[PDB]
Design a protein around this ligand. Structure first.
Ligand SMILES: [Mg+2]
Ligand SMILES: [Mg+2]
Ligand SMILES: [Mg+2]
Ligand SMILES: [Mg+2]
Ligand SMILES: [Mg+2]
Ligand SMILES: [Mg+2]
Ligand SMILES: [Mg+2]
Ligand SMILES: [Mg+2]
Ligand SMILES: [Mg+2]
Ligand SMILES: [Mg+2]
Ligand SMILES: [Mg+2]
Ligand SMILES: [Mg+2]
Ligand SMILES: [Mg+2]
Ligand SMILES: [Mg+2]
Ligand SMILES: [Mg+2]
Ligand SMILES: [Mg+2]
Ligand SMILES: [Mg+2]
Ligand SMILES: [Mg+2]
Ligand SMILES: [Mg+2]
Ligand SMILES: [Mg+2]
Ligand SMILES: [Mg+2]
Ligand SMILES: [Mg+2]
Ligand SMILES: [Mg+2]
Ligand SMILES: [Mg+2]
Ligand SMILES: [Mg+2]
Ligand SMILES: [Mg+2]
Ligand SMILES: [Mg+2]
Ligand SMILES: [Mg+2]
Ligand SMILES: [Mg+2]
Ligand SMILES: [Mg+2]
Ligand SMILES: [Mg+2]
Ligand SMILES: [Mg+2]
Ligand SMILES: [Mg+2]
Ligand SMILES: [Mg+2]
Ligand SMILES: [Mg+2]
Ligand SMILES: [Mg+2]
Ligand SMILES: [Mg+2]
Ligand SMILES: [Mg+2]
Ligand SMILES: [Mg+2]
Ligand SMILES: [Mg+2]
Ligand SMILES: [Mg+2]
Ligand SMILES: [Mg+2]
Ligand SMILES: [Mg+2]
Ligand SMILES: [Mg+2]
Ligand SMILES: [Mg+2]
Lengths: 96, 208, 136, 86, 23, 71, 116
RNA sequence: AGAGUUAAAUUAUAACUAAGCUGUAAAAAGCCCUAGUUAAAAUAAAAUAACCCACGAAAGUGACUCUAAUAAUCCUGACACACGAUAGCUAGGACCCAAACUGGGAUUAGAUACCCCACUAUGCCUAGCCCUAAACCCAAAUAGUUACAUAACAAAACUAUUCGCCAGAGUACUACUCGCAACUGCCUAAAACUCAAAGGACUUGGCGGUGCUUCACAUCCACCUAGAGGAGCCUGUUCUA
């Protein structure tokens, strides 16, 4: 992608390599964030379409008391919540 | 059509049922048949297990029936088989020993023969090309050919008799002449064959 | 290495049909035109032994186009040729038309034995301009 | 016409099967583009109307080449799928 | 489409040439 | 590439036609294809090499190109 | 190898003059062209002709030649069963490639990207 | 731009051989001084290579060889200068093949057309004109940038320096002028009048004697049966009364 150009480190023989220093700086902040939301008792929704890992991510999330959505994603899901999910509903506080 | 597609046809031949024990794939097959809990059709009233039933005669019988008269068609046929029979007995006793060995006294063999001999090999279908209808040579499937023979016999001995002449008689004549290939029916078969030979070039047109 | 097709005009190749050199075997010219076909069977010496046309075979203005007609002409041609006693034929097809294959088959089925097919179909290297295309 | 005869465009039928040898010769001419040229040259075709042909042909050849490649590249993944009904 | 402009021209030209022949 | 070695130029010509194979068959650089082509045409007009068929002498020589005629 | 597209198309940058004028944009489509149904020729024509010749020489007595006739019907049954077989044959495909349904799913799984 | 050369094909014209040969959806006319084969100059046009993308300012240029040869230490620039496809004009040659015109033949209600057959101006050369093209890549030249940014569609968006061009639509590649080897021409190019539009791109429909697949199950075709149209009569319309 064109917007990875900063996060990259450099090309090794055609294969691109991320900057792990930046990975840590970022991931720290991400995990911190995740945590501060969990502590504040709010919904967390993991999402992936990737098949290899589907099971993992549900198996992970079920054990967190957090929710996963790994599946076909119906269209108006978050946008039109009350029609899709139920008459009135709470929405994910954080999506991951 | 009061039969759904679930109902398969009856197989009515008795020789099949009485003597299964030497046939493996057929044992397997009729096992599949009734075991399948197969809904099977009430056998028709025309089809019987009678030792005397010749399906060809039945078809030809039907095609002669106008309206709903089975009775009448049956009778006309019966009288035709009969008429040929007696006519061939008359030819027999008035002949010489050699020809006594020759002559066919079986009206049935005479019938299957006189139909085998009247059936055309090729036939024409019209093809539309560039505005004109060309009559083109088409190889034919057997049943269509049988039909053409029977249809022809019936139409011929229906149309061209003088009114004082009964159907079974004339029909018998046409049967015995078609036996020896000298009959008008075969003239018809031959005009088919000739028309096919004249148009043979156009057998390119046909695409199937 | 069996049956390399193009036998050389040098004498290095001994292969005989009816004990003859490939040079001595009769040439059957086939000309397949869209409306016509004609075969002419000629000696290696160029003395014509047989001629059959789709028209000479008694077909008419359209119908003489067909492959039927082609094989028809082929048969009788090989009849006239067989009469003068030619066993084997090297064939050349000229033009590209309906009765190419049909006529070639017609020589075989007509009881004439075929060794070679070669295609001489005139292919302009951009000489004379063709007639204009048609609808226009 | 000045060249030695019978050397050009000549197949010699082997084991007496004619139809096979004719198919062979046909495959020759059609492989070299001579059939498309005879057929082309029955009538004329004007220079413009010719570059149009050329370009349409060559575009189409590019498309089909690429699409072919893409198909044969994605061929592997036709294999029956591991993750089914996740 | 733009042919519809050309049509006019085409006609006007034709109708002119015809004229200049008679005249 | 010289127009003088007709064997070489014969290597790139279709045996039955006398055609000149394209790059996609011969597999040559641009400059070498062009070189070969011109060379051939020269060899044809000067008449070291014939036009409408591959000289029989050279049919038995090593074959470079990727064409399969006979299958 | 794929024909070079460099410099071919009429574009603002290009100093050259055009080579290809595409009718439809040059992009791999997602789907693939549906199978082309092949047409028929006249079936059996040979035996038809042979049997014609036979009747011509024999003054149209069918009893004189059984051979040409039985071979004719041989061809008719070979023809009809060839049609039945080419009807059930739809598993044919390309015989070494895959039917255009498979290609189209497969191609939707790794689509081509014009946008972004 | 010269000068020289020819491989395929074709044609004269002979030698044989057969009566046909040509031609379409189907035919006809046409030709048998025809056709197949074997020989063979001129003229004309340059398979494959080319799935290449070069050379020229553009038009254009792709058979072969040799001669001459492709402006500018390189910005823009005309009504000036020099060129400019086809067709056309003038004079002289050429004439294989093609072919407006025209005459036959079909088709058609008609067919001054599409299809067929001949044959001509003309394409060809040498010299002189004419100066027009959907001469269009509809995208000006020369330096740049990929920042900002999607009317639509198409070939994504823009600076800077220039010249050229555009003020509703017709009217109008027209009328008058001016100039030109043109004198049914080219170039330049209005107004009266009329209208409230005229235009570009798109959107759903509908439609298509477009293309592709798949069907029709009393159903188009092929197929089977029995009838209507004819006759007498019944009975309903339509006309006369
Ligand atoms: Mg060319
Ligand atoms: Mg036009
Ligand atoms: Mg010759
Ligand atoms: Mg090509
Ligand atoms: Mg007007
Ligand atoms: Mg340039
Ligand atoms: Mg250009
Ligand atoms: Mg377009
Ligand atoms: Mg000159
Ligand atoms: Mg020559
Ligand atoms: Mg000649
Ligand atoms: Mg000649
Ligand atoms: Mg035709
Ligand atoms: Mg006539
Ligand atoms: Mg080409
Ligand atoms: Mg080019
Ligand atoms: Mg320069
Ligand atoms: Mg300047
Ligand atoms: Mg000019
Ligand atoms: Mg001129
Ligand atoms: Mg002339
Ligand atoms: Mg002359
Ligand atoms: Mg002419
Ligand atoms: Mg006329
Ligand atoms: Mg009409
Ligand atoms: Mg038409
Ligand atoms: Mg002439
Ligand atoms: Mg010129
Ligand atoms: Mg141009
Ligand atoms: Mg253009
Ligand atoms: Mg302009
Ligand atoms: Mg400028
Ligand atoms: Mg400049
Ligand atoms: Mg910028
Ligand atoms: Mg929009
Ligand atoms: Mg105005
Ligand atoms: Mg003008
Ligand atoms: Mg003017
Ligand atoms: Mg002026
Ligand atoms: Mg009906
Ligand atoms: Mg219906
Ligand atoms: Mg009636
Ligand atoms: Mg009535
Ligand atoms: Mg009333
Ligand atoms: Mg009244």
């Amino acid at each position: 992608h064109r917007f990875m150009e900063p996060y990259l480190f450099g090309s090794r023989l055609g294969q691109d390599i991320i900057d792990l220093e930046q990975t840590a700086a970022h991931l720290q902040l991400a995990l911190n964030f995740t945590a501060h939301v969990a502590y504040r008792e709010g919904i967390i929704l993991f999402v992936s379409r990737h098949r290899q890992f589907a099971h993992l991510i549900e198996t992970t999330a079920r054990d967190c008391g957090e929710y996963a959505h790994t599946r076909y994603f119906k269209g108006g899901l978050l946008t039109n919540a009350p029609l899709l999910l139920g008459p009135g509903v709470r929405l994910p506080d954080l999506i991951i | 059509s009061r039969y759904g597609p679930e109902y398969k046809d009856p197989q009515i031949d008795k020789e099949y049922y009485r003597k299964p024990l030497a046939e493996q794939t057929e044992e397997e097959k009729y096992e599949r048949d009734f075991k399948k809990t197969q809904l099977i059709k009430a056998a028709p009233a025309t089809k019987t297990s009678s030792v005397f039933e010749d399906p060809v005669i039945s078809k030809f019988t039907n095609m002669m029936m106008k309206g709903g008269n089975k009775v009448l068609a049956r009778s006309l046929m019966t009288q035709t088989l009969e008429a040929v029979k007696r006519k061939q007995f008359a030819k027999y006793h008035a002949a010489s020993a050699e020809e006594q060995a020759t002559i066919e006294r079986n009206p049935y063999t005479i019938f299957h023969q006189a139909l085998k001999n009247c059936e055309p090999v090729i036939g024409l279908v019209p093809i539309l090309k560039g505005g004109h209808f060309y009559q083109v040579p088409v190889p034919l499937a057997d049943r269509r050919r049988r039909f053409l023979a029977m249809k022809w016999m019936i139409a011929e001995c229906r149309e061209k008799k003088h009114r004082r002449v009964l159907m079974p008689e004339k029909l018998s004549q046409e049967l015995l002449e078609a036996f020896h290939n000298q009959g008008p029916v075969i003239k018809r078969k031959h005009d088919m064959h000739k028309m096919a030979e004249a148009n043979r070039a156009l057998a390119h047109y046909r695409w199937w | 290495s069996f049956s390399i097709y193009p036998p050389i005009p040098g004498q290095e190749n001994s292969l005989r049909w009816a004990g003859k050199k490939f040079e001595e075997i009769p040439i059957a010219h086939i000309k397949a035109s869209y409306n016509n076909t004609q075969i002419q069977v000629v000696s290696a010496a160029h003395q014509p032994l047989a001629h059959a046309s789709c028209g000479t075979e008694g077909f008419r203005n359209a119908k003489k186009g067909t492959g039927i007609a082609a094989q028809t002409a082929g048969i009788a041609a090989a009849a006239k040729a067989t009469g003068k006693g030619v066993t084997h034929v090297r064939v050349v097809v000229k033009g590209l038309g309906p009765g190419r294959l049909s006529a070639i088959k017609g020589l075989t089925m007509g009881g004439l034995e075929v060794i070679s097919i070669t295609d001489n179909t005139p292919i302009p290297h951009n000489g004379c301009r063709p007639r204009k295309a048609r609808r226009l | 016409a000045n060249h030695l005869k019978f050397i050009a465009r000549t197949v010699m039928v082997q084991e007496g099967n004619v139809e096979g040898a004719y198919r062979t010769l046909n495959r020759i001419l059609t492989m070299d583009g001579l059939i498309e040229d005879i057929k082309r040259r029955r009538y004329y075709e004007k220079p413009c109307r010719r570059r149009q042909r050329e370009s349409y042909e060559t575009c189409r050849r590019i498309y089909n080449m690429e699409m072919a490649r893409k198909i044969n590249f994605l061929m592997r993944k036709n294999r029956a799928d591991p993750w089914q009904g996740c | 489409k733009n042919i519809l402009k050309i049509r006019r021209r085409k006609m006007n030209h034709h109708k002119y040439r015809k004229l200049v022949k008679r005249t | 590439v010289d127009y003088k070695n007709v064997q070489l130029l014969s290597q790139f010509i279709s045996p039955f036609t006398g055609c000149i194979y394209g790059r996609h068959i011969t597999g040559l650089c641009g400059k070498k294809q062009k070189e070969i082509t011109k060379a051939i045409k020269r060899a044809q007009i000067l008449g070291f090499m014939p036009v409408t068929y591959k000289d029989p002498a050279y049919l038995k020589d090593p074959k470079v190109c990727n064409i399969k005629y006979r299958e | 190898a794929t024909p070079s597209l460099r410099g071919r198309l009429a574009r603002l940058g290009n100093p050259r003059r055009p080579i290809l004028k595409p009718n439809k944009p040059l992009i791999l489509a997602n789907h693939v062209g549906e199978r082309r149904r092949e047409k028929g020729e006249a079936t059996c024509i040979t035996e038809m002709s042979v049997m014609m010749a036979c009747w011509k020489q024999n003054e149209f007595r069918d009893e004189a030649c059984r051979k040409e006739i039985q071979d004719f019907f041989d061809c008719a049954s070979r023809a009809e069963a060839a049609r039945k077989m080419r009807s059930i044959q739809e598993n044919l495909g390309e015989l070494g490639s895959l039917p255009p349904k498979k290609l189209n799913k497969l191609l939707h799984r790794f689509p081509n990207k014009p946008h972004v």
